Design a protein around this ligand. Structure first.
Ligand code: SF4
Ligand SMILES: [Zn+2]
Ligand SMILES: [Zn+2]
Lengths: 98, 490, 444, 434
């Protein structure tokens, strides 16, 4: 994702190497720096795609909960839009099946 | 609407919508063809157009004309211009590499390389194979004409094969590295794995022992003990310091460079795997043996070509021991039409094989048994030329076409011995003894009656009918040569 | 001149090699055809009667058959063990989870503990495959194609560290009716081929078996194939001067005419090593039209495998060498003091099939569309007959008496056959009371 | 010719073999294509049309001897072939229109064959109930019938049968006051009767095809029938003849004469390009090499021809050996088939590999511009009336019919006696007349 969207390489630390990094201060500091850079990379990738404005607009048109459209699923948003439409036009909507 | 677990599920509405979509796609393809233009791909919302034109302005005008006609036909549906390619190669459904074109101001453009579905999983590929693959893909993605690209690729392959046969390739271009996941002794497949064999030799011979996650280098050579190529694996250090052994150029020419070359050069018309094999050396016939039968199922046949791959009937003469080959009813061409069953292939033998009608009718039977068991062995092989994963277990994870390969996660397994091959072999066994249909094939009645009276007495006709029935018994109900129109129409 | 010398010059004739049940002598004499005899084939659609349906399969059909197998077995185990819910194979979960799948190896070789792979069902995990680690498992017994429910730890979603293996549950026994308990004592002889030595065509052991059948006059006689061995040296090279069908008809006529005075019912079970028959499992019954009206009541042709009730007592008949095929590709945690035969018999009885191994042995043709219908166990058989090239035995496993007398002729020397005494005791008691009273494996 | 006049309903429930299935499909496709060709080249009222159509029917075994009630062979052939081709032609609307149009011409021809006796029995037995009138009623109302009749000249109410039908079923006739009505019954002669039968047949066939198109995805899964639904007109002809092998002996120096006299326009254009520019593109090379292999050239002769033509282009002979010998030897040799071994057919030339600038392959009547087409044909010494007829047929997408007329005109025959579907067959038939 960071190679495509951000066009920046990201080193990967295998889980096996981690315990060895605890034997010296510089390696643990590098591990902490790796975590910091990872968090910054997620923040940058989220900002690049405009995830928050897209979610806000989509939930404004569809009329559902922001957390549900952040989770994912087109069907939930379309279902909420159709439920709003049917409720406005004096209709009986289907119940939930399980 | 089309989701089974939705709240507003409606199967009839979804079916109607899909039917209208198929109708619109068919109408669009028909109208483009009626425009006298060829469509190269269509996927459920997309139509790819090969304009056969170099002027970008003319391409844009033609696309806009298509848009105008489509939007005139309908009211709300509107096809759109999305992008143009400068080069392209369709390998199969939903798989291509290309040069996306970005038009600049007034005529010029910018080309960017795009690839999808052209990923290679195995890291077990040598340096020479990767070099040849990158060279051929770089030539293919270039802007030159098809003839120039093909000629350059042919010259490169000829030079590579000549160098490999002569030995100009450095030994470092022969090392093959593979990483282990289990201990060398815990490989059930063991014998067919070269890296497992060499790692086991290293562990049981000297010092440093290989463990899970380690990488081992091996090279294929010629011991002279006529074992399988996988079992013939040695170490590059071992090969360099040993004198009795030499490089096996056949393995590197056939199983190393040819796969990576043919995985890209197969789609091009006029080029096939056998041509590439001939370019690299004296391979062809062994490669057609190595070739696939169902591969050509993308294009009625004549009797000489439907039975081309079928195995001829082989039977030893019970009194002289000489093998006899049967391929059709008669023998030779012209006036000398003696029955193939009249005299055995040995000149000195005076026994008529037809007199041994029983033995033949016995032998045939087991010949049918063998080819049946093969079809029921269930051997599946991966369709990707670089993977070639052979297994008998049918995975429950299916793709849109067939079973999905478990080693290379994006590939479909195909039967190694198809049902159609067995049906054709049974038909060939029926046909090699069918005098009834072999006499009507004669254009004139004179030769037909002459051969009928000279050799084909009612006794010989009854013998040939019995030999036909030997295979007709297997073809009668079994094999679904039957077509039930009751299930076909109702 | 030479052939059939060693068998004819044998000295172990009449020696009893195995006994089970109650001690009995050598005078095993029955009533022959006297009394009521109830021979009926039961189960699914009746053991297949026609020739066949196809010689051409479709891969989606096989996929559907395997998915259905996994789904029904998993549902039955879930209903038994009261499992709350299954977990997808690919979904990570820190807490221990239960998974439903089928065992399989990751290569083309022999299964071992380092190469186990669990393949999930289509309903839950969409046919996903994960490696299985058995380092923390105490007791287990695994073979390819075994529908199993595991309880383990899968924290990364790419490997399962198994901790518990649920034991399978067999089918309920056949419930006797009031009429079934009114029958009297009966005797059944069982023999399996080949009926001739590896170098002869005279079929002397067949004549010896006919003489024994005439002498002992049993109530029922079951004869397994092959009657014309496909692996015989004179057969595989096509030296015979007569068609295979004619020789098979001659042998069948000799068998039927020989035991006509005894009045004992004859049951012929085909095998995949018969040249004149179709080599596809399951096999249709033998075809024979030159049958008189008197012999139609004494000669019966059944399929393979067959579920056949004799006097209300269910027999499971199979000619394939299931024990040798399954026993070679099994892994267990115990090897010091454990009975391999009992373990594989438990696998067979708890897997609810006549050929549970998948994929089968390399030389084994199976039509899965017909396998799914004509080759399932309806209930747990009262007596299981599984002749095999291994050593003869008779074992009581899970209330079922499994008898393997071995081939009637092993190589150049003679073999053994078996005889069973059948009678149904009083219904009330400690539930399971074995109808099979005594079994005796005797050399021929 | 027998009682094969049947409305195609009640699909068969018999079972058959694969070979019979494919032979029936191919035979029916060939018959329908022949019907179209006859209708385009001729008219529906000449002796040539009927004679050729009945010859095609007899050759394809669709009207022949009888048997014991059940297994009348031509009836079974016709029924099964029609219901097989319904599946193949039910997919697309254009295919549906083609199938409906061609199937009605056969029905009209069959109805025209029958004498005025059996048609009454066929009408009575066909659907449920149909009737005619006797001589007494025909004579009693003769004047009213002739007065109500259309512009049919004279008062001659001849021996042609007159049928009484319910007025509603004759709607298309009685709404314009062209028939006689009495107690709700319309009296109609044979012409309007057959018009009504054709209308009902068209309606029922269109409805049946539309219904069949819905249940098509249930059968697309069969791999045996895949070359049926999608590949009945894709690149393989209905029944092709010219393949590899055969017998022939043609000299190398005689090619120039056959280029003007025998070769079809496409092959001759390719020959002109090869002889002039001394080089051809991949499509032209493959097309012309396969054509030259088809006419009877051997490996040595073809290699010598191509080398001599390419050396004149000032290249290295070793470069030709390393660059073009391989392709020719592969084309003449073993497997690697279905694209480099069988000479191209007319359908493959027309529907595949359209040409571009620098490419001279393809069909001139299909790909080349009409103005360039006339400019080309004027160089071949073609009569202007023939040019006009060829251009008229080119408009109606009858390219192969235009080439048939081309052959007939250039070789000075009224009818070539066949239907061309292959350039090699064109050459062979030109050699036959010599
Ligand atoms: S109809 Fe056929 S032979 Fe005639 S010009 Fe066209 S492609 Fe050539
Ligand atoms: Zn001989
Ligand atoms: Zn693969």
């Amino acid at each position: 994702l960071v190679q495509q969207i951000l066009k920046t390489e990201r080193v990967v630390i295998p889980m096996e190497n981690i315990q060895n990094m605890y034997s010296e201060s510089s390696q643990l500091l590098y591990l902490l720096e790796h975590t910091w850079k990872d968090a910054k990379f997620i923040l940058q990738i989220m900002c690049e795609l405009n995830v928050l404005p897209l979610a806000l607009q989509i939930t404004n048109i569809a009329g559902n909960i922001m957390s549900r459209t952040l989770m994912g699923g087109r069907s939930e948003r379309n279902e909420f839009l159709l439920l709003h439409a049917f409720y406005e036009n004096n209709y009986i909507v289907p119940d939930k099946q399980i | 609407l089309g989701f089974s677990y939705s709240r507003f599920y409606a199967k009839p509405l979804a079916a109607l919508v899909t039917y209208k979509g198929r109708e619109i796609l068919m109408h669009t393809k028909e109208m483009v063809q009626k425009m006298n233009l060829e469509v190269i791909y269509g996927d459920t919302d997309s139509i790819m157009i090969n304009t056969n034109s170099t002027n970008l302005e003319e391409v844009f005008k033609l696309g806009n004309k298509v848009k105008s006609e489509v939007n005139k036909l309908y009211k709300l549906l509107e096809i759109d211009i999305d992008g143009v390619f400068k080069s392209l190669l369709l390998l199969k459904k939903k798989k291509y590499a290309a040069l996306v074109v970005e038009p600049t101001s007034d005529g010029n453009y910018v080309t960017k390389q795009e690839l999808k579905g052209l990923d290679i999983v195995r890291r077990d590929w040598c340096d020479l194979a990767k070099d040849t693959g990158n060279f051929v893909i770089g030539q293919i993605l270039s802007d030159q004409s098809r003839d120039t690209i093909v000629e350059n690729i042919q010259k490169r392959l000829i030079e590579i094969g000549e160098n490999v046969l002569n030995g100009s390739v450095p030994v470092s271009q022969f090392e093959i590295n593979k990483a282990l996941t289990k201990d060398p002794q815990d490989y059930p497949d063991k014998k067919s794995l070269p890296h497992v064999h060499v790692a086991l030799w290293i562990n049981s011979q000297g010092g440093r022992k290989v463990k899970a996650g380690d990488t081992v280098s091996y090279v294929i050579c010629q011991d002279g003990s006529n074992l399988t190529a996988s079992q013939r694996a040695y170490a590059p250090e071992q090969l360099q310091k040993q004198d009795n052994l030499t490089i096996d150029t056949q393995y590197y020419l056939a199983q190393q460079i040819h796969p990576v070359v043919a995985r890209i050069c197969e789609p091009i018309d006029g080029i096939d795997a056998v041509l590439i094999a001939t370019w690299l050396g004296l391979d062809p016939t062994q490669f057609r043996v190595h070739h696939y039968h169902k591969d050509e199922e993308n294009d009625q046949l004549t009797d000489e070509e439907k039975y081309r791959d079928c195995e001829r009937f082989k039977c030893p003469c019970p009194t002289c021991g000489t093998e006899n080959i049967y391929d059709n009813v008669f023998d030779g061409s012209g006036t000398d039409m003696e029955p193939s069953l009249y005299r055995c292939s040995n000149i000195d033998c005076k026994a008529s094989p037809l007199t041994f009608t029983v033995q033949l009718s016995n032998k045939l039977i087991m010949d049918i048994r063998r080819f049946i068991k093969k079809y029921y062995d269930g051997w599946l092989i991966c369709e990707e030329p670089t993977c070639r994963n052979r297994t008998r277990h049918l995975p429950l994870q299916f793709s849109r076409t067939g079973p999905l390969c478990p080693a290379c996660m994006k590939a479909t397994l195909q039967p190694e011995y198809s049902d159609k091959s067995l049906y054709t072999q049974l038909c060939f066994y029926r046909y090699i003894f069918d005098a009834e249909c072999a006499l009507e094939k004669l254009t004139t009645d004179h030769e037909k009656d002459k051969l009928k009276k000279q050799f084909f007495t009612p006794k010989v006709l009854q013998d040939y009918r019995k030999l036909k029935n030997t295979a007709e018994q297997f073809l009668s109900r079994s094999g679904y040569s039957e077509v039930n129109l009751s299930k076909l129409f109702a | 001149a030479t052939p059939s010398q060693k068998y004819n010059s044998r000295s172990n004739r009449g020696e009893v090699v195995t006994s089970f049940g109650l001690a009995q002598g050598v005078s095993w004499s029955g009533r022959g055809g006297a009394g009521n005899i109830s021979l009926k084939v039961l189960g699914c659609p009746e053991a297949l009667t026609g020739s066949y349906k196809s010689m051409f399969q479709k891969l989606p059909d096989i996929r559907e058959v395997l998915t259905c197998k996994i789904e029904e077995l998993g549902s039955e185990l879930k209903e038994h063990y009261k499992i709350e819910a299954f977990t997808p194979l690919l979904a990570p979960a820190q807490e221990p989870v239960t998974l439903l799948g089928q065992i399989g190896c990751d290569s083309n070789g022999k299964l071992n503990n380092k190469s186990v792979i669990l393949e999930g069902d289509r309903e839950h995990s969409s046919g996903a495959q994960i490696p299985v680690d058995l380092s923390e498992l105490k007791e287990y017994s695994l073979f390819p194609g075994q529908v199993v429910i595991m309880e383990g730890i899968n924290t990364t979603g790419r490997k399962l560290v198994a901790t518990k293996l649920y034991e399978g549950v067999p089918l309920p026994f056949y419930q006797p009716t009031e009429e079934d308990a009114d029958f009297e004592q009966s005797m059944v002889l069982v023999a399996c081929g080949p009926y001739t030595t590896s170098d002869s065509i005279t079929y002397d052991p067949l004549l010896d078996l006919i003489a024994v059948i005439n002498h002992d006059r049993p109530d029922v006689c079951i004869l397994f194939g092959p009657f014309l061995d496909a692996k015989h040296e004179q057969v595989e090279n096509c030296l015979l001067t007569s068609p295979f069908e004619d020789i098979f008809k001659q042998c069948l006529r000799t068998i039927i005419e020989g035991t006509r005075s005894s009045g004992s019912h004859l049951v012929f079970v085909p095998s995949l090593r018969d040249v004149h028959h179709e080599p596809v499992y399951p096999q249709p019954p033998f075809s024979y039209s030159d049958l008189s009206r008197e012999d139609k009541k004494q000669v019966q042709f059944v399929s393979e495998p067959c579920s056949l009730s004799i006097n209300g007592v269910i027999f499971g008949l199979t000619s394939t060498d299931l024990l040798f095929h399954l026993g070679a590709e099994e892994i267990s945690s115990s090897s010091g003091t454990s009975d391999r035969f009992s373990r594989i018999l438990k696998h067979i009885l708890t897997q609810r099939s006549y050929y549970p191994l998948y994929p089968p042995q390399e030389d084994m043709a199976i039509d899965y569309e017909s396998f799914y219908v004509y080759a399932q166990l309806p209930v747990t058989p009262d007596v299981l007959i599984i002749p095999s090239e291994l050593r003869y035995f008779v074992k009581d496993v899970l209330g079922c008496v499994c008898v393997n007398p071995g081939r009637l002729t092993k190589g150049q020397v003679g073999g053994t056959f078996a005889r069973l005494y059948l009678r149904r005791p009083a219904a009330d008691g400690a539930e399971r009371q074995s109808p099979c009273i005594a079994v005796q494996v005797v050399r021929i | 010719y027998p009682h094969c006049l049947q409305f195609y309903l009640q699909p068969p429930s018999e079972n058959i073999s694969l070979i019979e299935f494919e032979n029936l499909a191919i035979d029916r496709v060939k018959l329908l294509k022949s019907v179209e060709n006859l209708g385009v080249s001729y008219v529906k009222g000449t002796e040539q049309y009927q004679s050729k159509l009945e010859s095609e029917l007899r050759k394809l075994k669709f009207s022949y001897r009888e048997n014991l009630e059940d297994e009348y062979e031509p009836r079974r052939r016709d029924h099964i072939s029609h219901f097989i081709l319904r599946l193949a032609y039910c997919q697309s609307e254009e295919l549906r229109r083609w199938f409906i149009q061609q199937e009605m011409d056969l029905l009209r021809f069959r109805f025209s064959i029958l004498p005025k006796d059996k048609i009454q029995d066929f009408l009575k037995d066909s659907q449920l109930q149909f009737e005619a009138i006797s001589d007494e009623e025909k004579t009693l109302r003769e004047q009213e019938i002739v007065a109500s009749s259309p512009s049919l000249s004279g008062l001659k109410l001849g021996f042609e049968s007159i049928y009484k039908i319910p007025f509603a079923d004759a709607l298309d006739l009685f709404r314009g006051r062209k028939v006689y009505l009495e107690d709700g019954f319309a009296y109609v002669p044979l012409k309007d009767i057959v018009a009504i039968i054709l209308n009902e047949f068209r309606a029922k066939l269109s409805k049946a095809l539309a219904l069949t198109a819905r249940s098509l995805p249930a059968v697309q899964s069969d791999e045996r029938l895949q070359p049926l639904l999608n590949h009945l007109s894709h690149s393989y002809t209905g029944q092709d003849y010219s393949t590899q092998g055969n017998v022939g002996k043609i000299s190398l120096d005689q090619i120039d004469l056959l280029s003007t006299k025998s070769f079809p326009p496409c092959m001759r254009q390719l020959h002109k390009a090869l002889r002039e520019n001394h080089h051809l593109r991949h499509g032209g090379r493959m097309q012309y090499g396969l054509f030259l292999k088809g006419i009877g050239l051997t490996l040595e002769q073809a290699l010598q021809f191509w080398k001599q033509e390419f050396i004149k282009g000032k290249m290295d002979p070793d470069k030709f050996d390393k660059g073009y010998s391989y392709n020719i030897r592969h084309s003449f040799g073993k497997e690697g088939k279905r694209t480099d071994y069988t000479p191209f057919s007319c359908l493959k030339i027309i529907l595949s590999n359209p040409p571009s600038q620098g490419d001279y392959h393809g069909c001139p009547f299909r790909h080349s511009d009409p103005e360039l087409l006339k400019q080309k044909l004027q160089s071949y010494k073609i009569s202007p009336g023939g040019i006009s007829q060829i251009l008229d047929l080119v408009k109606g997408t009858h390219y192969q019919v235009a080439c048939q007329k081309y052959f007939e005109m250039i070789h000075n025959v009224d009818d070539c006696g066949f239907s061309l579907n292959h350039p090699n067959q064109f050459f062979c038939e030109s050699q036959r007349i010599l």
